Amino acid sequence: CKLCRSPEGFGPISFYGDFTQCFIDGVILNLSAIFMITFGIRDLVNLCKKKHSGIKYRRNWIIVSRMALVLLEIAFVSLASLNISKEEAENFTIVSQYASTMLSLFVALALHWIEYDRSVVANTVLLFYWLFETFGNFAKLINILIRHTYEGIWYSGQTGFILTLFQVITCASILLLEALPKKPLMPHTRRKPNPYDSANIFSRITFSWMSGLMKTGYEKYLVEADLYKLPRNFSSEELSQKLEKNWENELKQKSNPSLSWAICRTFGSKMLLAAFFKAIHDVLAFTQPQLLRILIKFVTDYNSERQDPQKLPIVRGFLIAFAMFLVGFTQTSVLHQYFLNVFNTGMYIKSALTALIYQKSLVLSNEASGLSSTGDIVNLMSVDVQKLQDLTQWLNLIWSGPFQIIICLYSLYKLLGNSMWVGVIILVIMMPLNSFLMRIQKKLQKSQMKYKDERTRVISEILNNIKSLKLYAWEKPYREKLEEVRNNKELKNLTKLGCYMAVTSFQFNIVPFLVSCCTFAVFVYTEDRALTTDLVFPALTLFNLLSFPLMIIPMVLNSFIEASVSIGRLFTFFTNEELQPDSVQRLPKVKNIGDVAINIGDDATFLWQRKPEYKVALKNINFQAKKGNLTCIVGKVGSGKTALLSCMLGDLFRVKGFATVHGSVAYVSQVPWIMNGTVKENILFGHRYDAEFYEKTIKACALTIDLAILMDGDKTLVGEKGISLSGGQKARLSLARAVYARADTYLLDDPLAAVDEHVARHLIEHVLGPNGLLHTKTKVLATNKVSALSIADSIALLDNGEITQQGTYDEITKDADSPLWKLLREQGKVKWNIYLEYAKACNPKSVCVFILFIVISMFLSVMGNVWLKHWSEVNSRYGSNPNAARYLAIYFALGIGSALATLIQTIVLWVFCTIHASKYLHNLMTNSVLRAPMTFFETTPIGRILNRFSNDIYKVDALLGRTFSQFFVNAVKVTFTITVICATTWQFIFIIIPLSVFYIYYQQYYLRTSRELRRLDSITRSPIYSHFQETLGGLATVRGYSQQKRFSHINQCRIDNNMSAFYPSINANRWLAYRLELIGSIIILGAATLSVFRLKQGTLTAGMVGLSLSYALQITQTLNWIVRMTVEVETNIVSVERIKEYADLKSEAPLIVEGHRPPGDIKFNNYSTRYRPELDLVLKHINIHIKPNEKVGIVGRTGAGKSSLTLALFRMIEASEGNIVIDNIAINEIGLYDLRHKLSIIPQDSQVFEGTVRENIDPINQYTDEAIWRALELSHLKEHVLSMSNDGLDAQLTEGGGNLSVGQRQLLCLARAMLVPSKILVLDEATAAVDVETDKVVQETIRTAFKDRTILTIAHRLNTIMDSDRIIVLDNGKVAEFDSPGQLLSDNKSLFYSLC
Incomplete structure (x- = not known):
């Protein structure tokens, strides 16, 4: 059984707010010392083992200061044991924790030294050890000092106080000298290594490793070369190898494979760690309302004891405030490690599944590649993998949603009795209503975008026909038709969309109020006890916390089922049948020209599609191709001409006989394929540059003329979808690539059909025939054009997928058969002028009425909470609820006043501000565009012109107004939160001003750098899918040239570049969120500690602190809202900028003049x-x-x-x-x-x-x-x-x-x-x-x-x-x-x- 020798129990928290002495000694410091023993010995062994040379750092002042401070710690702890050896040394906790601390200090002394020479990162175990030693010694200092000030005695004597103070100072000092310094490297154009690799554990926790990138992106526009290379183990190759290594076990070791379990077995460790952090976050998030209750109850008890033994101590209040700070700080610290781990797992699944999809595509049989469309597969990479990446973000809510709900309901039940259930019922009832309203929102958004596309098509008509439109003076009738569509359909629908957003905003304002109003009503009219101020406000916080899980669980379930569908699609893909890699056994070169066979078949059979076909395969082929000779294959369309080349290339499943091809092979498809890029790149095709042979190939091929004709020579860009070239030069270019490859075997699948006969006679002489440069290389050609037959060394003719006649040109000539008859920047300032232009469009009076109703809604919400404060103080003064009817009526009146003010808010926003501005801007832009001179329509492409009428006007219609509304809502809410906190404690001004400076600083850094990073992410995202689609197009030739390795490597580089841009993109969200939640927790600390000072001054009531902290707890959410909405406003307002730059276009001469015509020379x-x-x-x-x-x-x-x-x-x-x-x-x-x-x-x-x-x-x-x-x-x-x-x-x-x-x-x-x-x-x-x-x-x-x-x-x-x-x-x-x-x-x- 537990036993101790101190009058204060072994229990964690003493009568005062601090930890008891025997818990600080027995649990905190003991456990931190044992932590160092275990894990510091583990790390010490690992670091001593792993390396002894090369990377070692210089023995600068840093290491000597560290060692000296550790020695001072041993000095002070030995001196402590000396100072305690007689002062009741029987206390097992004290003496044992001195022993443990001493041994742990020796371990730390060893670990500092063994670390310093080896590790780049300041050791995690050592950093946590000093954090816990500093915290434990600080808690002990607080304990000793509290008992001094309240009981007149020092437990450790006055010497012990000074000695513990020295321990605190030295622990904090060595903590800082471990965390901050960079350990100089002892000195001896690709992206620099990722800072995350070097960040020590505190830097990783605080995301202070992102700060350099945030500053750089704030001061300059980021090009992709500003990003850091991807972290240690994020490489797509590594991750795909891991996932493949597990998926192979799924395929071969299990009775039935499961891709979901492949992914889990591969990446589940990070998700388990994230689940741990999420559980800690949930626990702390619901301790925070309990600290709020404890503080309110403490304030009421303190005031009740000071109104007219062991009177409550104020230090309990201060320690409750500081515990609230610690709870918030640990919430954010564990929450963002949870987000780090889940998003890292999402990126792993993304970059692993993407590379596995690419690699599987390379190996797919033509059977499966025909069974599935190219668009379907590229969507498999683009979208289906996206569902699995997104799934990671929500996966832990499968249990953390219920876990928050379970403990939130328990907390509310314990707080508020059974009346909880009416508020829970209201939330549950409004969830399906929320789904219904959002479904209507989606329907109206769909209808609005349909109308937008219709009117965009009308605009496209007008723009593409602008020449004739202006010539005929038809501008007026078509502009009136455009206005008719706009005003009668699109804006008419937009007013309804605005009305339903107003309904939605009314709901999101009233329901959070209504749950608490109804639960307090049921409580008052069913519970025989006072609705006290320690019940009302913790109840508000707990219902606020309850709202999120209940309203997000449907989204989590949706994502889960959708990702299950995506898993099904991916599993079907990965299990598709493959190429039978031993169909054609490739073999090395052979030297002697002319004689030896290179391609072989012996009565073999090759199926196109396995499961339906037998005895219908391309079959009984006995075939020979031999070095240097040109052998030509002849056959009708569908005869198997292409099939035979596919066989010797290896694309077909064989069941009888055998086949082989010696040496490397190059292949030209009947339909040419040109990867997007320069013609030079398409020709070189990954082979090293030789200028002389490159020009020789361009000359031997007739490509020279086209290469001169094209607008930029060989650098001419083959654009998206290859539009830059036409079929003839496309085939010529494919042949050029084949020639340049200088392969040992050539499989020319009918290049010449797409070529003029004269150019073919050129090609056959310079390339194919013995006069050509390829005379030393094996050539198989599949064409029915007689010239190839005339030059060929030997001929084969096949029909019905069977070889019918074969021999040299001589024998096939002598046979007189059918073949014989034929053959014989820095970042800019915010563009405030555009913001004011949009305000001018919105009728500044109308926008002022909007802001006024924001103010009124928030004011009535705040006065609802102030009335709740008054009502709860009244119930606390009484022992019962005196005038439940009156108080509930007024509280309900104020809450509904807020809700109706929000309804009027949104009605004004849409009907008067946003729709008026949208109409104004559209009319202005269209009127200015149509009256623009032809200079405009010729210098700017119709695509760019139409983009403003399609996308930019749409954003102004449907996104910009909403985003300004949310921005102002959250900004006013923060202003009123600060107003309430300052009204409760006016000294809070001095805390909110510095925190205001920090908030604006981080908000600006994020506003710039996050836009930069998301831009880079989205830019680098598409090349993956475009490259994959290109490869799917070229899939046959990629295998033909047998450079699957090069194409797969290019894919992995695309994936790695996307992750190189994405990883900062979301780690910036972590950086911002940590900063803002730290600010929020410091705001809670300031409000709480200043309120406790006001209590010490004898002028604080429990309701004032309840209200102030009810607001201070929620401020941290509004801070993130404000930052996000500034980001979204900045992204949308460029829409108004882009619209204005056309609305002010220079117009052509005046349309009508006083010289009106009365009515031919x-x-x-x-x-x-x-x-x-x-x-x-x-x-x-x-x-x-x-x-x-x-x-x-x-x-x-x-x-x-x-x-x-x-x-x-x-x-x-x-x-x-x-x-x-x-x-x-x-x-x-x-x-x-x-x-x-x-x-x-x-x-x-x-x-x-x-x-x-x-x-x-x-x-x-x-x-x-x-x-x-x-x-x-x-x-x-x-x-x-x-x-x-x-x-x-x-x-x-x-x-x-x-x-x-x-x-x-x-x-x-x-x-x-x-x-x-x-x-x-x-x-x-x-x-x-x-x-x-x-x-x-x-x-x-x-x-x-x-x-x-x-x-x-x-x-x-x-x-x-x-x-x-x-x-x-x-x-x-x-x-x-x-x-x-x-x-x-x-x-x-x-x-x-x-x-x-």
Whole structure:
């Protein structure tokens, strides 16, 4: 049985708030000494063993100071034992812990020295030993001093006090000299080693190893070279080898394999450690409310004893406050080690499963690779593995969720009686309601994005057709249609989405209040005891803690089942059947040219797909290929021509006979494959560079011409999906790679079919034939082109998957068979101007009303808690609940006031602030874009333009307002939390100001560096999936060249780069979270200790501390919320920046001017213009005069300004000098709409819009049905619309479809031209995209409809203008040409004459 010799019991906590002497001696210091014995001896043995040379550090002042301070510790502890040898030395705890401490100090003395020369990391055991010695000696000092001040005696005598003080100082000193110093290395472009490897245990706990990266990312934009290389054991190769080594046991040792247990057996140790840390976190998180109760109960007891033996000591209050600090600090320290371990396991599963998926893909049989799509497999890597990575984050909540709920319910039951259950019932009831509301939120988000995509497609129509749209002056009708869709569908849906977010926010405000209100009501009306202030506020904290597990458990279960589905998919993948690696036994080279066989088969059989096929395989092949000779395979499509090459390559399952291929082999597929990259990289294909042979290959292959043609030579980028090249040069490039590889055996699967016959005759001479450079290498070629047969040394012909005839060219010629007949940066400041621009859009009065209702909601919530404080103090003054009805009514009134204020908050946000701003910005951007000059639409791609209408406007609509709302909610909540704490203890100002400085410091560092790191992570994430898809495309050639090792290594490098960017990404979240939770725990310490000082001053009530700490406990969550929301606001507000940079675009000339037109000659006056303001004068000093009915043909060189004439006449480009006159009025001042809508055109780029024929003919609806039908009838596609549908004029054209082919599309444009008053008409050909039928119809329609009005024709086909009575040739932009086409053709050897 337990026994002791001190009046204070052996129990942990004494009458005062500190640990009792016999617990500090008997448990804390004894156990820390024994910890050092055990684990320090273990570490001492390991470090003495492991190394003795090379890495050793310099014996600087650091080590000597450490050793000296340890010696001082031995001095003071021996002196302690001396000072206790007679003062009741019978106390086993004291004497035994002195003995243990002395032995442990000897062990530490040894361990310091043996560490210093060996380890880079300050030893973990030594650091924890000094932490526990410092804490134990400090607790002993506190004990001795408390008993001095309260009982007048020193347990260890006054000498013992000073001696323990010295022990405390020396332990803290050596603790710091162990933790801080870096142990200088004793001196003798890739990324630097990860700091995590060097971080000692305290640095690892506090994530102070991230601080360097956070500072660097705060001061400069991070390029991937700023990241540190990945930690010690994070390599994808190592992790995939581990997982494979276990998965092999699953496959071969178990009766039935399980990939889930492979993953568990591999990575479960980290998850067990994380589970331990999570359990400690749960325990501490629910001790914190118990310390809150203890403090409130202490305050009430103290005040009740000071109002009118062993009166309660204030040091108990101070020690309760400091225990709350320690609880918070240990919560954060263990919580973030839990997050570290689970996220590390997630990254392990990611980088392990990704590399295993790649490696398995390399080994997949073509059977499985056909059985599953490339997209499915790349999604297996991209998404299914993602579910398993995400699963780690939630896995421990499978038990920690219930564990928090179980102990939270126990705590609430013990605190609040059975009335707990009404609050628990409310939470449980609101969980399904939360799911229902979130399902509606998802539905409306889906509908809103559907509307967004619809309106984005309308925008795409407008943008891609902007040329014709501006020319026809159709800007107004299409912009009004866009506005109609916007305002009537997208914003209409957005108002409803806002209303339901308002409902959701009302719920999230009221339910946390409502649980406590209802449980206090049931308590008051069912419990015969006072609803005291030590019940109300701990109950609030406990319900707050209960909310999270209950509301997150559904998400955890969802993730668990979804990851189970993903595991199923991965397991099916890994078990797919493989290549039968011994199908073709590869063998080394053979020297003697010409004679020896290289490829062999002896009546062998090769199946395509095993389980269905037998006696239908490619079979009975007896085959020979021999060094240096070219042997050609012939066969009909599907005959097995490709199959035989696949066999000798090794892609097919054989069951009879044997096959072999000697030496290395190179392979060219019938369909060429080009990995994205430079043409040089595609040719070299991982082989070392030899310039002479590289150029020799480019010359022997006809690739030289293409290599000269392409815009950047061999550095020309084969872009995503290989769009940069066409089929012929693609096949040529594949052959170039094959040649460069200089393999010993060549398997040319029909390269020549994709090549012009002349280029094939070049290739066969330079490469394939004996005259080629490959004459010394074995070549098998599979083509039916007769030239290969003519050059081939020996021939085989196969059909039905069977070899039919084989022999040398001589025998196959003599046989007269069918083959014989054929063959014979620093970071910038925050862009506050954009924030103010968004506020201006939101109607600053409206945004101020929003902030006002934030203030009112938080104010009424705070006054709800203040009324709860008053009510609980009233019940504490009484022995019962005096006016339950009144107090509950007022508390309910204040809580509901807060909830309704939040409802009005969100209604204002959406209906007045966010939706108004979204409409303003969209109208401004679209209006400015459409009135932008062509400079804009030509200098910026339609993709980038459409991106602002698609994504940036969407973010402003649906994310930015929500994020500002959350930011201001949490900022106001923190402001009111600080206000409450300061009102309770005004001296808290001096604590919150320094902590404010630290908070802003960390928040800024995180805001910058986290955006940088997430950017790098997302950038480096995609190359993994794109590379995997590329390899899946090239899977056959990757095996063919037999450089699976190189491709797998490239994949592992992609994975390692992604992790190199990701590991900082989330360790920055750990860094921030640790800082913010440390700040929160220091805030709790400040509030608690200042409240206890106010108690010492005799002016604190229990309710004041209850309220102050109810808020101080929650402040740490709002701090993280504020930081996260600043991050998200900064990421979204660039949307408003990107929108504004278009909304202020330089607009073209004024649309309408006072020179309004009253309603056909054209005259130029020294006119000149540029195709761009920055380019030179492409059109110079024209003065042509054109008579009212005159037909004018325009001709010129390919670089002449003839094309710019139509742009000039429509004033789509302004006059550099001079002007243009129409009907004796200068158009240069007439206004763009008034000008353009009065001229006909058939634009060179015929363009169509979605909608009725009406919308593509008369979108303004300004012309009559009879006239529209007349135009369609004249343009000879009345018939086409009637064939399309019975809707006739309402028949619908679609963008991206093919309702109207180009010719009838030009007739549609001609109809558009016919409707408008054609006093002037302009037309141009689709450049070299016309036919004689389209011509004749065009000219006959023009003669019919426009001959009586001016016509200007720019078409380059001269037949279109031979009949004109006037012609013009643009001599490089100087008009200088004469009247008639016939006169020009006859009177001189004109350019016109030369062209004709």
